[PDB]
Amino acid sequence: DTKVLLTEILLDPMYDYAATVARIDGSIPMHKPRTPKEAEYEFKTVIGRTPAELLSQKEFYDKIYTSKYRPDFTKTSTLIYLRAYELFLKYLQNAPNFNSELAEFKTYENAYGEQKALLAQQGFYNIFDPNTGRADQRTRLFEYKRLPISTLYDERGL
Amino acid sequence: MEKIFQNVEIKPFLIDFSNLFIKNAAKKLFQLEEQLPLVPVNVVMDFKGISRAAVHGLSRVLQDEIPNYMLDIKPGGYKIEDSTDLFMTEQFIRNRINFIPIYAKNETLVFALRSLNNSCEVKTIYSRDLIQVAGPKLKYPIFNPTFEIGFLQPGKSLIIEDIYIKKGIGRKHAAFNLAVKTHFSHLDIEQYPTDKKEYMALSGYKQSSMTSDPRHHRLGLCFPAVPLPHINQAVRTYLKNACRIIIGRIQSIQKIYENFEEPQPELVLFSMDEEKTKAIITIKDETHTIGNLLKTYIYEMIPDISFVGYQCVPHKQEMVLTIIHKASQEDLITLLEKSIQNIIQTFQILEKNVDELIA
Amino acid sequence: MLIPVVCFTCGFPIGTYAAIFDKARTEYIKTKMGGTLPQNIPLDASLQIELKDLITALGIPMRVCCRTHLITTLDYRKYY
Amino acid sequence: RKEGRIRKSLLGSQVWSISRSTICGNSDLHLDEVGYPISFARTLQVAETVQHYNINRLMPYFLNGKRQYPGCSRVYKQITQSVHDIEGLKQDFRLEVGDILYRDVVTGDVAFFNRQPSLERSSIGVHRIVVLENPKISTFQMNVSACAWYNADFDGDQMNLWVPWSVMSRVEAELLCSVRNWFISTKSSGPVNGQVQDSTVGSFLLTRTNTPMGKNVMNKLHAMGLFQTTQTDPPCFANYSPTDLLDGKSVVSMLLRQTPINYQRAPTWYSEVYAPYMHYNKQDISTQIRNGELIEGVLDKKAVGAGSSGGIYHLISRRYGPQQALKMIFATQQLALNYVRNAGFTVSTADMLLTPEAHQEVQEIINELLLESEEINNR
Amino acid sequence: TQRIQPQFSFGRTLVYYPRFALEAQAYGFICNSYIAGLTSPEFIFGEMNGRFDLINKALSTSSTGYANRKAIFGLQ
Amino acid sequence: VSTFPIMRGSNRCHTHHLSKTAKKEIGEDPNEPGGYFIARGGEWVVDLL
Amino acid sequence: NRVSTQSLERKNLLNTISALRTVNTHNTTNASKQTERADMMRRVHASYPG
Amino acid sequence: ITYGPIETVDNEELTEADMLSFISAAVNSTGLIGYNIKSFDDLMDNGIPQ
Amino acid sequence: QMILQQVDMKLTEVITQARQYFKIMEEKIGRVQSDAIREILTMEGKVDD
Amino acid sequence: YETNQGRQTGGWYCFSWPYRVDMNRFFQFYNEMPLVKTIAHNYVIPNGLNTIVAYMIYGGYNQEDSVIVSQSFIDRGGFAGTFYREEKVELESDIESFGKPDPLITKNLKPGANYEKLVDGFVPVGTVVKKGDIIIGKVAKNKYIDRSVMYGFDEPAVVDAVMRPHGPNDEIFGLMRLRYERNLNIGDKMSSRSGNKGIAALALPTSDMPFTEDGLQPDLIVNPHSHPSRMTNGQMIETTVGLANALQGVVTDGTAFLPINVQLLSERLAQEGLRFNGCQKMFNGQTGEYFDAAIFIGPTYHQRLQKFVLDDRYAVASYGPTDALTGQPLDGKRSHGG
């Protein structure tokens, strides 16, 4: 009963998210567990209930780990990360509002993505025509230039 | 003699802090307002009265045939139990650490990397985070502290405990490469104006390489990390060590020559038809440096040679030098020993000139 | 995932100035981009961003390989 | 159907003792040689039956065993009529007569080289094995002039290689299926192999009368360096001073004097469509070889190219055998490559760029073409 | 052996050329060199030619296989 | 009655209601758009027919 | 089956994007167009551009 | 809508590199993949229920 | 042919003698020291004289 | 050809790669934006590197689509990455379980197998596994018959991740992930963005590589003969433009059908101190002798195609699995015989 629970929850990405949040907050050791005792302690802190306690009742998402930082949201990277984890938890728990909070945070994350995309620019540069200070449009392409008929025939029509 | 290694120019590569962007970035990244403890140094050397083979062999040795030091991770140094980061793999960090240029005098130094990201931001790991755990305390750093080893995701850690100093040569692993090529030119061969359309497809020299024998050369080599105060000493040590390496490698094949009468697997002698004697010298793990030097000096010592040549085939990993001469085995051996002595004399003169030119 | 510690072609330690170069390039680019959005910078036909003077001030030599690997290498943390 | 019993199991078959790998070029291998990675040489084995004449030769293989190359993996003892592991035979000291030793593949062994689709009689050929002792090489290396047998190129092609282990198969491989038998095409009755790409251009550059630098000559040191990798006995340069100048025709004659042939044909270099422009050297447009001596003309695709009927290699095969032809192909390829090692050869963007005047001329020509088209339209 | 057929519409070779166009460019005449660069209709015609080359190369293997197997079994 | 396969990134996907950071932390590619099906472990893209 | 699908081969991101933008010809067992139509359907058609 | 006169449009300074902006706008409108997720959402919302 | 043959058999006998010595040096005197004999006997080539 | 090759190019195949257990996936560590980029790189991350390429003849080792590669460029991480293999094994029924078999557990223990390095039936993460090693020990039902799976691959691997998830049938299974250090090897396929495939035929040390008078040396040496018949002039133009881009510190757009003038770009090369062509005086690295002709050398974006010779090569001995029907060997490397 506990083995299936452990293999189902330890491979849940929600468990890894809550575990890394706890590691950031310092509630669990920064390293992966090396003994069964500290693995059980990590499960207790991350899930919020012991594996035996979970098998008794039905609620799962209510006791998942919450940040101790209390990051007043209303420098930027930490706020974005903590708000993202809080919204992930609220989505799992089916919070009352969620959707409006999700839209607001998606706008803020769009702004932060704008800043990050600014950090990712390597410079462009355009080759300019010296005569016209714009993108160079000079080419060696073919021009029709209808020719006089003397280039193909002589005065005798040959 | 007569100072074969003529004047040498030494020019370190320094950060121009007059640039506002560079100054601000350095100040707010590393609190750096002065030059780094280790800087690259550009060494331009003029050589007169010396074959192109010797100068290029010195360049090749300084590039990837001189012993050099690297930072390396011992097996099990990467702590799998403690390295929670999923992107900073052992291969990636090992590649970054292997190629950090280090100027180390003591090989017993051991460093450790204990970077723990207990924040919500991605944390960059710098070489300044490489703390020494073994060996004498470094009075001067052996590497610059501005290298980005890697980055840690929030809540992730990277633990490496056995970063030690490894010795090797560049031709085996490139992290032992010492000098990068900066300039090479012959000052005794006239050059065309290559900015014109008539000469832009040619090399520029006014003599064909198939007929020219330059004896005046300018060699430019850059060393990646030498201490800022002791630049001249580092360059002098590098040049001397290259000369010693060449001399020792030449003496290694000279020792084969002294036992031509005793059966040696490396040296084989024949007497084919017309009083000619053929000598074949096969050296395993020998490069083009020794083969080219040997061929050049044998050909100089025996201008009337029937045939001299070598092949460093990329497979079979060996150098096979073939000498054919209208002589006997004894006289051929004396001539080859004389050529070896000429090579040794030339490189000892180079060592002396290095000593008396870079103070 | 980072600017290489040394130039891939010749082994010059371009990674000594990689962080400083990245920061200074960001600051310099911010002074050349006008109203264009950051993701539209590679599409702006009026942009003329030159990093030659920045790299020279860093002390990196005028080497094709070194400047190429310094200015073209992608940083993983900027995309992840 | 193809996957059915007949076509998949009777007409073809899956086999043991066979290897496959990507093929790459190796100009230091002879045309009848193949580069075999050592890890494959310790996987495929040759069955040598221990007798009185070979016991001394086979003893080092037995002693090396599975720990050192060249060694062995299995021994088929005749007294027990069964196969014995080499690690269990530590007490045998020597080998008995009638024993069968499965030794590692060594340099000089014959191997069957095959590239699918097998469409020609030369699609399977026998090459002498050259074992590549570099552990980081996993490819089947071959000379670029050997690719014409298999219609192969080094862009991802994979070839099958199996070493004959039985005595009859080895006899046949070295007597019947060697690639020297496929030098002359069964299809076209002409030569298959020759100089390709860099070798053709190198032959032209070496045999041309003049360079942009003047007369195409080299000193004695560089003339000797042309024969460094030819794998032949070098010619004598004792009658040459260090300042003496040798033209490329002289070294080509030094190489070709071993198999004297008579050749007289205009080179591919001289084209009548090019003649109005350019200025052809009169000594470069009439290639003549008399008794192995290159008198005049350049060597290019017509004389040394692969598949060139009537070329120098075809004549060498006709007068001295296709093995001599393959050896001469390797020697001349080495000569050309060693010449290019100093002459240099490149292509640039400016090589394909017309001058503005030439661009105007081209535009005028295309305008005339379009004007004729417009006249037809007006009609 | 023939020029580009008007397959876009009745009398049209491409959307870039008018119906019943008489200019040579509308029927696959490429006036530009590779080094000069091709325009979009020129590149489309060149892509048609190259796709023809690729199709012929691809089905050459199969057709040669069929004919070769038949000939081998007839002559072996 | 049964279950129905859900396109990644669709309205019925869980990553639809997660931010880029949350998608990053749960092992999803934050910059990928999705558009594939996760069936029997593998990833499957329904092409345009 | 009128569903055109393939395994998501994650060789790179360009491979994934191109897989999501791939248009596949319809496959039918009875005919499959094994005539001169075979090389007609593989050509660049004049309606393709854009 | 009565558009302005075409004779007063200033376009001589428009470069071919400026049309990359139009292509980028088109790509942003499409998203390069958005059609498939849109069609699956349509199937889920109306297709299967109907 | 004969001189190349005579040196050939001489070499094969020498190699056989050396490696027969080496196997004996496994039971008599252990591997770790014997594997040290071969190690620095190979970097001077030998290993077979 | 480039449309085909650009999709097989190694790079950052997924940004969530450490979270996935994927088979035959290659993650290339270093990727560069092309010096001459296009509009496509605004929407997909570029895959490849701006390798310095010398278009020349060097010993005949780059003939017929071969390329000479710098060994130093390979060592420094050029096109290096990690190759990932997955090993999913399932318990057939309740009569099978995960564990380390013993001599009494044998009934069929594999000859020459290791059966060591197994902790709780699985090889721990971070352990090097060779050809004969047994990864994941499974026993059925002596009192037990061995059903453990062997490594088998010629190339050694490292256990990167191992899990014990439940399957769709609510049963536990395997899924070990194996990690391979994959540097650029001889025989690895490379390509430019113009469709010019190249097999690495030779790796040369730094001293053996040709170098310019200013010290520039190539990562790759590409045969000039690959150009004429193929007419991949875009690669030449990209090299010419990137030569000036590198010295100018710029990243020019080279999207198709943009206004292009090769003469103006070649003139732009002259304003950077270089020749009108991209050709420079180079010296032979092995002999130190200059070439009589200036050699066109410059930065060309190159892609490592995910066709690894270590995965394609195969050699089999006279023994192995045979078809029960025909008695013939099984099919291919995957079946370990054929």
Ligand SMILES: [Mg+2]
């Ligand atoms: Mg091919």
Ligand SMILES: [Zn+2]
């Ligand atoms: Zn560099």
